[PDB]
């Protein structure tokens, strides 16, 4: 929350918080940005209403993050105040994985069935307690399923941050599209923009790999949101 503990978290895996920016960049960016940017910076926020374009002018002037690390402020204040705000959580972390990591999520998801191609980045998403114990004692004895959920880009900071898919609701028969094969998630996960200064290149396209407890519920829907849990994320830059 402070501007050394981001300092701190920016400089052990930058790829992890280059992500977040991006996928902030994305949901900001968005014509969407009302209903996608969920969470969103209260010091941006009069009441309910939101200072998009002052937002939008704070996150068109962040540097780099190597840039940003090499400044420590003192002048650009607004910048580290809004980088801070965004690798914020004290419900989970993202972590950078290798690529040995996406055959550990092939063997999951088993034969890739349909030919497919290689993330650029990987990540791992580390949940806290008390949600993080509370989800193994849900599984109990029940064994843990790997599936697939595309999304465009700029939904991944706000399924990042209240999950998959929130339940205004109003309909009847919703719930979380899955499928074990990928080719049919990526034609649902479109390149979109991310963030002009990311490491990982300014057009990424993300996938969703979800924990799911094997309960009774080629792809499959998810009603209940408590026995899923978004656990990678599959990134492309094209
Ligand atoms: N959104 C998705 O990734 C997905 C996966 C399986 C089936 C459908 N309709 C969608």
């Known amino acids: ?3 050394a503990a981001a ?7 930058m790829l992890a918080a280059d992500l977040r920016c991006s996928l902030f960049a994305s949901a900001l960016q ?3 940005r009302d209903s996608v940017l969920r ?3 209260a010091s941006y926020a009069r009441g309910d209403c939101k200072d998009f374009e002052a937002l939008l002018a704070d996150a068109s002037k962040l540097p780099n993050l190597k840039e940003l690390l090499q400044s420590s402020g003192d002048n650009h204040k607004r910048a580290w105040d809004l980088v801070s705000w965004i690798l914020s959580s004290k419900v989970l972390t993202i972590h950078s994985a290798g690529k040995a990591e996406f055959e550990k999520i092939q063997k999951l998801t088993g034969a ?6 290689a993330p650029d980045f990987l990540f791992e998403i580390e949940y806290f307690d008390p949600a ?8 109990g004895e029940r064994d843990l399923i790997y599936a697939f959920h595309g999304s465009r880009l700029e939904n991944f900071h706000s399924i990042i941050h209240n999950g998959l898919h929130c339940h ?8 979380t599209y899955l499928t074990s094969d990928l ?3 990526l034609i649902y996960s479109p390149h979109g923009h991310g963030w002009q200064h990311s490491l990982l290149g300014p057009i990424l396209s993300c996938v969703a790999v979800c924990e799911v407890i094997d309960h009774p519920d080629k792809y499959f829907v998810v009603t209940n949101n408590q026995l899923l849990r978004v656990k990678y994320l599959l990134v492309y830059s094209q």
């Open 1 to 3: 929350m402070g501007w």
């Open 7 to 13: 300092r701190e978290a920016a400089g052990r895996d």
């Open 30 to 32: 968005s014509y969407k």
């Open 39 to 41: 969470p969103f910076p």
């Open 112 to 117: 890739p069935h349909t030919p497919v191609p």
């Open 132 to 139: 993080n114990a509370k989800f193994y004692e849900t599984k």
């Open 168 to 175: 205004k609701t109003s309909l009847f028969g919703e719930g």
């Open 183 to 185: 080719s049919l998630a």
